[PDB]
Design a protein around this nucleic acid. Structure first.
Ligand SMILES: [Mg+2]
Length: 905
DNA sequence: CGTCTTATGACAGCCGCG
DNA sequence: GCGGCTGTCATAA
């Protein structure tokens, strides 16, 4: 009923807009938008417009956008500030939609497609589009259909029609295993020549023009190829037809290495899912191929084919088309799980930006703050250029490398946004400065009180207490939204453990899963039904609860990063509200806050245990403290606990009823000390970690900063059915560590924390024996391939050449001259294996594209010359040496006087 | 989109050192 | 041979 935009675009003096109207139909505008900009004026000229500092401004209405834009630059030639929203697209959206936008996703045309191109030359470069497009699968969210465009005849072979009957059948019948739930949604259309296929695709494109266009590498491959191929056959004008406003532009992306070209389609928002994944998944992956991510996300994988992909359409055209359809579907399957598109939509409409601007936190916040200031008749300052300057960040405590038996951790909730709100940090709320004492003096409360009238930060900054800042006001809206979605997420997590516990002792019956909302804790009535439920329907409930959890994670993690990005933007020279005073004010307050409460926790627990000077806090990073619970348990005596859950319950109550109130009054005192606007430093308990009761097992260990492992029984309110390992920083968490090595090192840790030294020594022995029999990919290292050309000296390694780069140059020599094997792509990742000396390849290592097997033309030699000893030492033994040294254990039993006896019975 | 931030670790190349 | 130094790549916040 209320109308909303789809895409907005500026072309010359006109604004081009696609939108849904009051009746719910998609329409297009061409508006000659008249933009306003502002200039400072004297006190006499009474207006309603004021800048953020309170100074008056006069309004300048322009005849067109060209006039407004060129008024800005000649204001600089005089040397005067040109105020207001210079991005006229954002100005238009704000005027046209001066209310909270409530959109309808069912009316937004979201499309994802993928292309197939047969190429014997090697990789088909989008910039050249030298080879025919032989397949296109295009999914439309409004129709809910997969549109398949098949080429029967090309210079690379004539093929028969694709059979949907064969596609549906299982591999064991000679079928393709195309998921049954999409079979009835496939609209198939074969073509005699490329020109007919490409011409009908454009007609289809006009009839159903995408608003959000997505897919896997659509921006870097699919879109450019379809654009350039149409251009080369039909002409530039016909290629422009992919744009609703017939306007396209080649955009050049250049970073600290090389450059690449993409194609901007005006009037369409392109959200490449590979980029949504990298931004919002919070995972670093060894490979970013669709087959690899699909396997990680959905535990599926694809049916394997014989021969190279360049010969696939020839040998097996049936599978060729089927795989293309499947690939278009898995993006949708990943989105069903992660929900990054819905996230992007909610975010973009809230900020009132082009949907693709979700990739730019600076644009996002610049729009949010502008809209907030516009409501109050206030005028935003001009964007000014600044030199890049370093500034201090968080505090990280230097831990003593040791094992730690009983550990309990605490985190500050939304630290940086909370500091902003507590101290009232904002551009227009700066009051002044005070003489700053050493940071240590504020921590112990020995320094004099900074101000009696203003809200202070230990970096020397003072802020107004009565005035509410734009930044604190707009951040408040976001943090309360995170509290809700994290609440849903944690309840889904808690509900998951109840079900996991029910899978241990199930009841074999024929029933269905219970219809419940997993975002809320199960009631007693639902719990008793779960106990009498079948393992089949329990596994379905578990799948659904975890899927609800993942949906909760996505939402809360995105709000987390967007809020932290506001702090981050303050330290970025391009942000309209760039201010290192405000940036440092935040980080210095945090530094004091962490170290302050460390002192308080140490004081409290010493009084509680009847001792003095004992160091209870062992570690901290930014907003967290890790407390040694050894003494707390010892004061009671661990003989008084009947099982593991007993002492976990005890520390839980100790934290909630004793430590947290003591923490609250500590921070409350600090609030008075800094004279802050409001007390918002709240600390929740996170981990309760320790060994199983009665077992050998070290519970946890630290090796250094950002590197530790814990055996966690309870995390932030969720009581695990089985203890989960919390490992931070260690090699098991790095995408560069081989897959099999990660798994082995994790088991090493698990045995250390839960079972003890003798168990570790046992597993080491067995892994060391069966090491050589592991899949070569699973034991291969991963690294990013940057600056290959920089170290390439006539095919051979130059000075200071990194290990993985040495591998690539070896690979390139091995595949040199032969028509085309898989090529290593600049900027992407590679597998790395060490080679034994004397190998037919030039060097001590080899590298090839990750997520793939090496060429069969070189595979057997690599396997034969693999250096297993160097690989075991570098990737497995050396890291395990690190863990065991820290924990004061041996992974290998040291020589003893006992060796001079015979213990074999 | 290509204009969120700092802190901090491991590891390999190069090179000194009778 | 190992330790200092720097480049590179990765993570924790
Ligand atoms: Mg494809």
């Amino acid at each position: 009923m209320k109308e909303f935009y789809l895409t907005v675009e500026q072309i010359g003096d006109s604004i081009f807009e696609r939108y849904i109207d009051s009746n719910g139909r998609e329409r297009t505008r061409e508006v000659e938008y008249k933009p306003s900009l502002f200039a400072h004026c004297p006190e006499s000229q009474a207006t309603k417009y004021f800048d953020i500092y309170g100074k008056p401004c006069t309004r300048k209405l322009f005849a067109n956008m060209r006039d407004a834009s060129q008024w800005i630059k000649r204001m600089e030639d005089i040397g005067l500030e040109a105020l207001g929203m210079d991005d006229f697209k954002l100005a238009y959206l704000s005027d046209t939609y001066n209310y909270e936008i409530k959109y309808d996703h069912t009316k937004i045309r979201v499309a994802n497609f993928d292309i197939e191109v047969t190429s014997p030359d090697g990789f088909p470069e989008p910039s050249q589009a030298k080879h025919p497009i032989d397949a296109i699968t295009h999914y439309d969210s409004i129709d809910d259909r997969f549109y398949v465009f098949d080429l029967l005849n090309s210079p690379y072979g004539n093929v028969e029609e694709w059979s949907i009957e064969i596609a549906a059948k299982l591999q064991e019948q000679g079928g393709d295993e195309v998921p049954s739930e999409i079979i009835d949604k496939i609209i198939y259309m074969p073509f005699d020549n490329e020109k007919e296929l490409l011409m009908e695709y454009l007609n289809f494109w006009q009839q159903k023009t995408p608003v959000i266009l997505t897919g896997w590498n659509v921006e870097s491959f699919a879109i450019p190829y379809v654009y350039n191929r149409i251009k080369n056959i039909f002409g530039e004008s016909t290629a422009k037809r992919l744009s609703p406003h017939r306007k396209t532009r080649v955009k050049v992306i250049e970073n600290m290495y090389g450059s690449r070209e993409i194609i901007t389609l005006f009037g369409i928002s392109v959200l490449d899912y590979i980029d949504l994944y990298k931004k919002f998944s919070f995972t670093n992956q060894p490979s970013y191929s669709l087959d690899y991510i699909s396997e990680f996300e959905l535990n599926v994988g694809k049916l394997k084919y014989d021969g190279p992909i360049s010969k696939l359409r020839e040998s097996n055209h049936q599978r060729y088309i089927s795989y293309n359809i499947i690939d278009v579907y898995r993006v949708l399957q990943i989105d069903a799980k992660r929900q990054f598109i819905n996230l992007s939509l909610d975010m973009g409409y809230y900020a009132k930006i082009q949907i693709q601007s979700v990739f730019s936190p600076i644009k996002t916040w610049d729009a949010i703050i502008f809209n907030s200031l516009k409501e109050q008749n206030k005028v935003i300052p001009q964007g000014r250029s600044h030199p890049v300057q370093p500034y201090p960040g968080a505090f990280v405590k230097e831990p003593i490398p040791n094992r730690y038996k009983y550990v309990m951790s605490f985190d500050l909730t939304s630290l940086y946004p909370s500091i902003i709100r507590q101290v009232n940090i904002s551009p227009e709320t700066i009051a002044g400065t005070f003489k700053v004492a050493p940071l240590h003096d504020y921590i112990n409360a020995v320094a004099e009180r900074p101000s009696d009238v203003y809200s202070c930060s230990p970096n020397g900054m003072m802020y107004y207490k009565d005035r509410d800042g734009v930044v604190p006001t707009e951040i408040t809206k976001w943090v309360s939204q995170r509290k809700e979605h994290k609440g849903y997420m944690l309840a889904a997590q808690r509900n998951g453990e109840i079900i996991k516990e029910a899978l241990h002792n199930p009841n074999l019956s024929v029933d269905e899963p219970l219809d419940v909302d997993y975002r809320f804790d199960f009631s007693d009535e639902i719990k008793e039904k779960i106990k009498k439920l079948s393992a089949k329907s329990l596994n379905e409930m578990l799948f659904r609860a975890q899927r609800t959890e993942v949906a909760g994670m996505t939402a809360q993690m995105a709000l987390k990063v967007t809020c932290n990005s506001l702090y981050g933007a303050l330290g970025n020279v391009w942000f309209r509200y760039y201010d290192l005073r405000n940036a440092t004010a935040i980080t210095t307050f945090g530094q004091m806050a962490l170290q302050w409460i460390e002192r308080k926790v140490n004081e409290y627990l010493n009084e509680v245990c009847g001792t003095e000077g004992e160091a209870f806090v062992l570690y901290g990073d930014t907003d967290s403290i890790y407390v040694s619970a050894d003494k707390i348990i010892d004061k009671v005596g661990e003989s008084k606990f009947r099982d593991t859950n007993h002492w976990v319950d005890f520390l839980d109550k100790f934290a909630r009823e004793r430590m947290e109130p003591a923490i609250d009054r500590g921070f409350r005192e600090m609030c008075e000390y800094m004279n802050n606007k409001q007390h918002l430093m709240f600390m929740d308990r996170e981990a309760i970690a320790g060994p199983p009761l009665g077992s050998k097992g070290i519970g946890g260990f630290w090796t250094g900063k950002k590197r530790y492992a814990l055996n966690v029984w309870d995390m932030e309110g969720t009581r695990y059915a089985e203890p989960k390992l919390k490992i931070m920083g260690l090699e098991t968490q790095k995408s560069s560590t081989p897959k099999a090595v990660q798994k082995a090192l994790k088991e090493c840790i698990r045995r250390m924390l839960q079972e003890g030294e003798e168990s570790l020594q046992e597993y080491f022995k067995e892994f060391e024996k069966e090491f050589r029999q592991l899949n070569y990919i699973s034991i291969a290292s991963v690294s990013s391939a940057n600056n290959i050309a920089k170290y390439d000296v006539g095919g051979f390694p130059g000075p200071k050449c990194p290990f993985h780069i040495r591998g690539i140059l070896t690979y390139n020599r091995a595949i040199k001259g032969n028509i085309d094997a898989p090529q290593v792509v600049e900027g992407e990742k590679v597998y790395v294996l060490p080679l034994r000396e004397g190998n037919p390849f030039g060097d001590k290592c080899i590298a090839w594209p990750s997520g793939t097997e090496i060429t069969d033309l070189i595979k057997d030699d690599v396997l034969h010359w693999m250096d297993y000893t160097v690989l075991l030492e570098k990737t497995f033994i050396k890291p395990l040496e690190g863990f065991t040294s820290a924990a004061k254990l041996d992974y290998e039993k040291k020589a003893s006087l006992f060796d001079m006896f015979d213990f074999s019975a």
